Amino acid sequence: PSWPQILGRLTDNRDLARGQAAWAMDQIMTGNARPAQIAAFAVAMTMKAPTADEVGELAGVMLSHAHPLPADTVPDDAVDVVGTGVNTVNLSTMAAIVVAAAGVPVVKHGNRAASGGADTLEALGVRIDLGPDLVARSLAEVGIGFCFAPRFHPSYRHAAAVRREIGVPTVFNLLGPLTNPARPRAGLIGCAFADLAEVMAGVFAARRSSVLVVHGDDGLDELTTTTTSTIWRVAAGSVDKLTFDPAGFGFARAQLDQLAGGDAQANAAAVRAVLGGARGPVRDAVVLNAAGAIVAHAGLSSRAEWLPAWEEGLRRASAAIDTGAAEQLLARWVRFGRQI
């Protein structure tokens, strides 16, 4: 195997042979790929259009170089809440907090902005750069933790530099959600693009995860309140693609602009406001996505069906805000950081 062969096959617009994406990612993670090869590969795979099998090899190779959390310290039922990345408020970060406040372990995964989720969390007082043991204590003691991507994926630094140098979105942009070092088996995963969402869903299905890959039919990388969303429901090795409509649960149609963010600070303030009871479109979307994650989580253990699960989901997410549990959980998480 070699770059000219792998690159050639991609520009000839052919799917790779089994193991070629893996070999390419390995070269990249070991510092043996030149930046030009890295770039050529990311672009060529983006424009050929990666298959689920190919993306699975990239993510699995990436994980095999990651720092793990200490074994037997992430619950069997932890969930991730995360988009692939419209200058909006950090709906995922808020949802994550709400999900944790409703009783469900959450472990998120991220970096400082490409206000990114990580920046907002820092702007809220949360310590984002913790090692595996403290991330694990965060889970046990607060019910949520955050894995800072560069501490857990140090070998990804060559690819990271190339991604900044070229700017453009590529296949690499899919790996965040698939390389959460805590390896939760459940999640709600937001995707800007419908074609790539199906691929993403294929990768999760081969992991036997219980996940909802979500794409707003307005292009939002979360469940939206402005229109329908497409959900790829993933469980027990298979995919149930469907059209989801939140009007069915009584959510008013909102405007895309009503969900708009700003600096880390603006987004921190939006979080403090929603968690403190402010009604509105932002809350509506936060609750919608929190319920989504709660439903995914239910996929791991419960036999419960789609609609009843969505209903429990919504009531739990609502109640976690209204009872102050979310606001209280955030304060507890902050405390935890300061008590080293």
Add this chain to the structure above:
Amino acid sequence: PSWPQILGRLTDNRDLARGQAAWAMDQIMTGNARPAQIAAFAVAMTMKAPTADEVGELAGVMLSHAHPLPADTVPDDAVDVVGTGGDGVNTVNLSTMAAIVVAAAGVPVVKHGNRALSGGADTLEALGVRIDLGPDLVARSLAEVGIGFCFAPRFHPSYRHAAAVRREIGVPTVFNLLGPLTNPARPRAGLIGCAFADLAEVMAGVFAARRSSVLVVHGDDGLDELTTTTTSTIWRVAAGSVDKLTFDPAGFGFARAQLDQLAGGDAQANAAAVRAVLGGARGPVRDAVVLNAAGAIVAHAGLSSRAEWLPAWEEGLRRASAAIDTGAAEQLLARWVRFGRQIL
């Protein structure tokens, strides 16, 4: 204008806005493009599929960075004989031979290339020709011999950043088209061979915008030359319009040949094949060389005449044959080698 803007547009399978490819190429030529950026651009332009306007921007910016040939030193009617290479076939240097034959028929020839089995430049050196010369001397060679060679790394030094990336990734890209389009002597006619029929119509397009008289040719068996093994596709560029054609050498009495009968080797081998043909040896190689020489002569005729196709090929083929059988072609190679040896 930026890399995110330009690359994002290409990955979305869109043609670029005017000026974008030129900005890119400018960054690349001035040292300001990071290797990753050069690679990303090359690959994305390839997979999107470039337009003639995009490639004309790349080429024109590259030319603006080249060393000049001195004024009034290139005849109004010089021709190039050149292929994109990369056919993957490893044949004898058919272009180098045709170029010698063409110059021997009285058509001034100005080639342009690099080293690579064995490239045009490498074979030229194996024959004793000095390929590494400054523009004064290339101009002088043209005037005193009837042919010159522009060594690409000497005329396009600023292309060095692009050339390193090309080597690191090793895969054919849009940059593989630029050689024929950045000949520093700016011949207005040529016979341009293309490995890939897709990009040939694009290549024809750029020459058409230049108002050149060019035959862009592709062997229907994958050769970047006119072929004797089967038919060829030709894009005739004249008066600013392209025109696609199927050409069949059997219509001038050429036997079908076998691809391995045109097989190359190291610089010593290809040099011995040149010697044999120029010396009068008959066979598939000679045939191939005469065919492609005539094509270049037909392209040259297109400059100062609107002569008919079949007679143009008939004069073309008789002048190439004669050029060899009179000994002119052999003599001209000797003249070229002697000229280099006088430089001191």
